Amino acid sequence: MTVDFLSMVKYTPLFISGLIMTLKLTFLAVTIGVLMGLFIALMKMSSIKPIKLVASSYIEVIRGTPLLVQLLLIYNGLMQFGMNIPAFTAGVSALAINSSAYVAEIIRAGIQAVDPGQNEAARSLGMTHAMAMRYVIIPQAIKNILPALGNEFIVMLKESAIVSVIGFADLTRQADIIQSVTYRYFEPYIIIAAIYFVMTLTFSKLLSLFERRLR
C-alpha cells in the first residue's frame, strides 16, 4: 500500500525476540567455533604430516566454500540418513564449524605476527621452542588474537541471519512472520536492518575500545 511504521510498533516483542535469538545463536556458535578453532590450529602445528594435512584441508575447504552450502548440507543433506535435526542445532553446528576454520587462521596469524626477534632472543638465551612459546611468544600472540576474535563475532552476527532460510526464528525470520499478518515486508525489513546496524556499531565501538586498552 503505502508505508506504515506505526503498524509495526505492536510487533516489537517479535523484533526483540528475534534479536535475542540472533545473539543466542551467534554467541554459542562463535564460542564453540573458537574452542574448535584452537584445536584445529594445534593440529596444523603438529609435525605428524597426516594431522597437519587434515587441519589444512579442513580449514581450506571450509573457508573456500559458502556458509549457505554448509548450512544446507547439514540440514537438508542429512535427512536421507534418517536425520531430523532441529533448525537451532543445524545453525549452531554450521556456524561453529565455519567460524572454527576462520578462527584457526586467526590464531596462526596472531602467532605469525609477533616479531620473530622475540623467538630469536628467547632461543638465544638457551630456551627451547616450548619455553619460548610459553613465556614469550604465546602471551603476545594472544594480544594479537583477542581483537580479531572480537571482530569475528561481529562478522558472525551478520552471518547468522542465514539461519532464517532454514526457518529458525532469528531477527531476519521475523519479517516473514510479521508480513504474514500485515502483508508488509518493507517496513519490518528496514527495522531489522536498522537493528543489525545498531548492533554492529555497538559491538564495533566496544571492541576497538577494548583493543586500545589492550595496547
Binding site: 616479531d115 626477534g117 622475540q118 630469536e120 632472543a121 628467547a122 638465544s124 638465551l125 638457551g126 603476545q140
Partner: protein, 240 residues
C-alpha cells in the same frame, strides 16, 4: 673455542656467504667490518646457529653443532647474542627480562636469580629501572638491558650484531662503553659494527668482509693504517 669452517649460505637465489672460515679463541675481541650486504651478520649468526649453513660446518668447543647430533639449546646457553633491534620481551619488566632464562633454563632459585639481576643492572647502570617496562626505556637503556639479560646466562662468548646501529648518536657511547668494559674483563667477543672506534680501542682482530668472503684480516692498526687489499682500501676510504 669457535671454528666456522668454509661455510656457505644462500637465501634462495641470493648467495650471501660464499665460503667463510673464522677461528676465535678465549679472550679475543674480534670485530667484523665491511660494506652493506657483505654477509657480516649472517656469519655472526652461524655461530649460535640462528642461521644454518648451506654447506660447511661450525664447531663450538670442538664439537660440530650443525649436524643435528647435539642439543642446540645447551649450545646457545654458552653463546650469547645481542641484537641490533634489542628484542626485549615487552610484557616483562627489566628484572624479569633478566631472570627469565636462568630460572627456566638453568633452574636457578628465584632469590639467587633476583640477586644476579640486581648485580647486572647495577653494572650496566640500570638499577633504577629494575621494575620498569621496556617501553619506558630509551634506546641506550634498552640495549644495556639486553646486555644485562645476556650476561645473566654467564656465557663464554658474546656475539654482537650491530648493537648500536639503531641508536641515536647521543646514545651510541654508553652502549660501546659497556661493551669495552666487557673487553677489558677478558670476555670473548665477536662484534659486527660500523663503529670503527670500538675496534681501535679494544679489538684484538679486524675481519673485513666483501661479497660474501673474508678478503682481509689483521690487527686494528694493520687494517686501519696498512690495509694491503684494494677492496679494504676502497671501503676504508669511503668509511674513515
Amino acid at each position: 673455542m669457535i671454528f666456522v669452517n668454509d661455510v656457505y649460505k644462500n637465501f634462495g637465489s641470493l648467495e650471501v656467504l660464499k665460503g667463510v672460515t673464522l677461528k676465535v679463541n678465549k679472550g679475543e675481541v674480534v670485530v667484523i667490518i665491511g660494506p652493506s650486504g657483505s654477509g657480516k651478520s649472517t656469519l655472526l649468526r652461524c655461530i649460535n646457529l640462528l642461521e644454518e649453513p648451506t654447506k660447511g660446518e661450525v664447531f663450538i668447543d670442538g664439537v660440530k653443532i650443525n649436524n643435528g647430533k647435539v642439543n642446540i639449546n645447551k649450545v646457545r646457553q654458552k653463546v650469547g647474542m645481542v641484537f641490533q633491534h634489542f628484542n626485549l620481551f615487552p610484557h616483562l619488566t627489566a628484572i624479569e627480562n633478566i631472570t627469565l632464562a636462568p630460572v627456566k633454563v638453568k633452574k636457578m632459585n628465584k632469590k639467587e636469580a633476583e640477586e644476579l639481576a640486581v648485580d647486572l643492572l647495577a653494572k650496566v647502570g640500570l638499577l633504577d629501572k629494575k621494575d620498569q617496562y621496556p617501553i619506558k626505556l630509551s634506546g641506550g637503556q634498552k640495549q644495556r638491558l639486553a646486555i644485562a639479560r645476556a650476561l645473566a646466562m654467564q656465557p663464554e662468548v658474546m656475539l654482537f650484531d650491530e648493537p648500536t646501529s639503531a641508536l641515536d648518536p647521543e646514545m651510541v657511547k654508553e652502549v660501546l662503553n659497556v661493551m669495552k668494559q666487557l673487553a677489558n674483563e677478558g670476555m670473548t667477543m665477536v662484534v659486527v659494527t660500523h663503529e670503527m672506534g670500538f675496534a681501535r680501542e679494544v679489538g684484538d682482530r679486524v675481519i673485513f668482509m666483501d661479497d660474501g668472503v673474508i678478503v682481509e684480516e689483521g690487527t686494528p692498526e694493520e687494517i686501519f693504517y696498512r690495509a694491503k687489499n684494494e677492496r679494504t682500501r676502497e671501503f676504508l676510504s669511503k668509511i674513515l
